[PDB]
Design a protein around this ligand. Structure first.
Ligand SMILES: *Cc1c(COP(=O)(O)O)cnc(C)c1O
Ligand SMILES: *Cc1c(COP(=O)(O)O)cnc(C)c1O
Lengths: 454, 454
């Protein structure tokens, strides 16, 4: 089948996530056919550097033949059985045991789902059920942040702070509130990042008192905001958020769907930033994207509460799916046993962060060069001196994104932020290869900008 | 590694869907280890007849080594790439094209998810977006039915009509309404099923008029209610429902997550009952549960509307997952090319239905014996003549279900309804084997019932 034929059928039959279907079909979709290591190939034979690891998720890289064997094997002995009928199976039990070993102490119990979005919905129902069991039926409001992302279920879309999502579905649903994000470049004023972190955290206390603590169930946040543009909060932020949650008896929830499983060099983002959530949600890197699986890790306090509540009338047919569990188990064992997470912390992470800042810090319209471990970013700005952003935030980002895409480099544009999260197994030489291409693209971007009078 | 050790680890680490964790952990979970055809084996070596096909989903049966090979091949080539970045891949394109061939005309476009619950959330958001595009922002209420089931996301749980789900999470969310279910045994009074079908359908009309039609976006229903107990509506019901929807310009949605992919003998439940929905939701049988995947099949009218609205800000990371799509393609090809669906319609379906009715007709406390294709059921009753149900609906069903499991037969109890949906590939010999066990179990049930208080 040819490229044109694949594009024709896709256009005729397939509706994509977060896309303008009419526009995509007119332009024709790029057809990705093969993956190896940190590279992809499309139907036209182009070799491509995947600086986004699929979608923040292919942490061990492409080409894991042993994962495929594990999946083949499980699918042959027991492709599926449910966990609804007072029933279980070996794959899900073994995964549960292994996860308990790589997660912080006090996270022994896990609830499985198919996606990060379902994980978030599960977490929402869990935190509300918890307060009901505690004898506090009014404590039901969850607080998230503007520009935070927590998936695409009705629940996750509501808890998320993307107005372009809220506007489709009559969202958010009741019992959801939002505070501003800890984006220093925009909101920092004449504060240092550290003093801004305290101020941005205290926005949470302001909202809790506005609503009434007796009505607030939880605060939920990504340790680093992903889809929002890799917004890295100041070091003072999460400790203050935690102090506030504790003061007002509000549950603290980390959404680890992106930061989870080695992304920051720690196993989980909350470990890097030094707070202790009562639950956290996961997916993506849990299986390195090799098969769909998500999870909610429930701390002991919330677990006991749920357990005391009897029946928990929640779950999905494919919860604990044997094949996905078998692959996830192989992935997590690899991340640990092959020293992949440790390598991010000790070796490739520090190297990436150094080289990232050496590469982009010299560009006239790049600023806020940032990142940790193997997630990094910067922002395209009109004038660094005034911290002035381009109008129509996102239009310039698209231009630069298309230049990357044309040059067979995948880095994503989130508004005018450029972000990257490559496979964790990326070599130092691969890191340098990617940056050399990225640098060339920014030079092309800089000239294209000046040449358009922008 | 022994039964005991898996049960200790499951208790210690695993939170299951729809169960009392405290009780299960005390009693011990049943460990399912392997499957072949229509049979399962547990860690204790018991051979089990799976009369529920996993969870209404293992439609081609266990042991498809060809599906495992399709999975392996795809996972080695491209285990994942996203469909977000103006990108696609051959597996999802191929599946989309095959699906268009087995779905009714006018359904050419499909949106992928990981589960039936995500499909329902997707459908809710599409339905509301569609009406926004029409310039009718108040046309946002979706109507479902009491005892309907549409998943376990916050959205799906709210649209579903299970009170016990509503009472956990503060559901339903706004813009949801419910009408009574077309359960003739309970609500039929002195009407014929056909007369009742019209009355029960008209409950939708009176609800629309109570709310106001300009505020009603859609009616959503399972052609046959699954988790509610295989409630089979009279022949007159769906045509009247459809007539009412057209009268009030209300979208009609079939939830085919169970009835889909051959369960009734047609490819889809709505084909059997002769109505034409504007969208329908799928999962389960889409891949015979071999991997998690779901879909929304979008008809031409709504597709046109979504497409006219530019960005559709919705979707999941693993939407259209290559490996899952490759396995679903294999499954759908098998259902068609191996004549499995046709065989349900022409051979095993009629046989099952005849034998089901022959088997359970004689029992004193069994009534409303029903079914179509390879979904069938009956209800345990205190007195047939009065159509008097036992009090504490569900307690007596539990008694009977337990007898089944002690005799290595899986049939589910939904309240006091006993239900069955075995793999579609079940042979006539296997049907008779299953019914011989079940008949024995019902004889024991009548015994104990009479022995300890009818
Ligand atoms: C991607 C993502 C989700 C949702 O995961 P899906 O698998 O796409 O449903 C939730 N939270 C965060 C932080 C994410 O990055
Ligand atoms: C099982 C089911 C769902 C939900 O599917 P999951 O894959 O469990 O999320 C939705 N609708 C119907 C009719 C179902 O039977």
């Amino acid at each position: 089948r040819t490229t044109s034929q694949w594009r024709e059928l896709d256009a005729a039959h397939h509706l994509h996530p977060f896309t303008d279907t009419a526009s995509l079909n007119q332009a024709g979709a790029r057809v990705m056919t093969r993956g190896e290591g940190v590279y992809l190939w499309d139907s036209e034979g182009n070799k491509i550097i995947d600086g986004m690891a699929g979608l923040w998720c292919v942490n061990v890289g492409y080409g894991r033949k042993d994962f495929a064997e594990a999946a083949r094997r499980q699918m042959e002995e027991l492709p599926f059985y449910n966990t609804f009928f007072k029933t279980t199976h070996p794959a899900v039990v073994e995964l549960s045991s292994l996860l308990a070993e790589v997660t912080p102490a006090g996270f022994d119990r896990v609830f499985y789902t198919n996606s990060g979005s379902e994980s978030v919905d599960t977490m929402i129902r869990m935190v509300r059920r918890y307060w009901d069991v505690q004898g506090k039926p009014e404590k039901k409001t969850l607080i998230g942040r503007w520009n935070g992302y927590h998936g695409s279920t009705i629940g996750g879309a509501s808890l998320g702070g993307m107005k372009y999502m809220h506007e489709q579905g009559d969202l958010p649903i009741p019992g959801m509130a939002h505070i501003e994000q800890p984006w220093w470049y925009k909101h920092g004023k004449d504060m240092t990042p550290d003093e801004f972190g305290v101020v941005a955290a205290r926005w949470l206390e302001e909202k809790i008192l506005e609503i009434g603590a007796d009505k607030v169930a939880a605060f939920v946040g990504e340790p680093i905001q992903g889809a929002g543009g890799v917004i890295v909060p100041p070091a003072t932020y999460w400790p203050e958020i935690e102090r506030i949650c504790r003061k007002y008896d509000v549950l603290l929830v980390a959404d680890e769907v992106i930061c989870g499983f080695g992304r920051t060099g720690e196993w989980f983002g909350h470990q890097h930033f030094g707070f202790q959530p009562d639950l956290f949600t996961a997916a993506k890197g849990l299986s390195s994207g090799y098969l769909p699986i998500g999870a909610v890790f429930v701390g002991k306090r919330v677990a006991e509460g749920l357990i005391a509540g009897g029946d928990f009338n929640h779950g999905f047919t494919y919860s604990g799916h044997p094949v996905c569990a078998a692959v996830a188990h192989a992935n997590v064992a690899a991340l640990r046993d092959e020293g992949i997470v440790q390598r991010v912390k000790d070796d490739i992470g520090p190297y990436m962060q150094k080289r990232w800042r050496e590469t982009f810090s010299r560009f006239e319209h790049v600023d806020d060069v940032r990142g940790v471990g193997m997630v990094q970013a910067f922002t395209l700005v009109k004038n660094k001196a005034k911290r002035e952003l381009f109008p129509d935030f996102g239009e310039i980002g698209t231009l630069c994104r298309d230049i990357f895409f044309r040059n067979n480099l995948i880095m994503r544009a989130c508004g005018d932020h450029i972000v990257s999260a490559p496979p964790l197994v990326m070599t130092r030489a691969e890191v340098d290869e990617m940056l050399a291409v990225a640098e060339r693209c920014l030079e092309e971007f800089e000239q294209t900008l000046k040449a358009r009078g922008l």
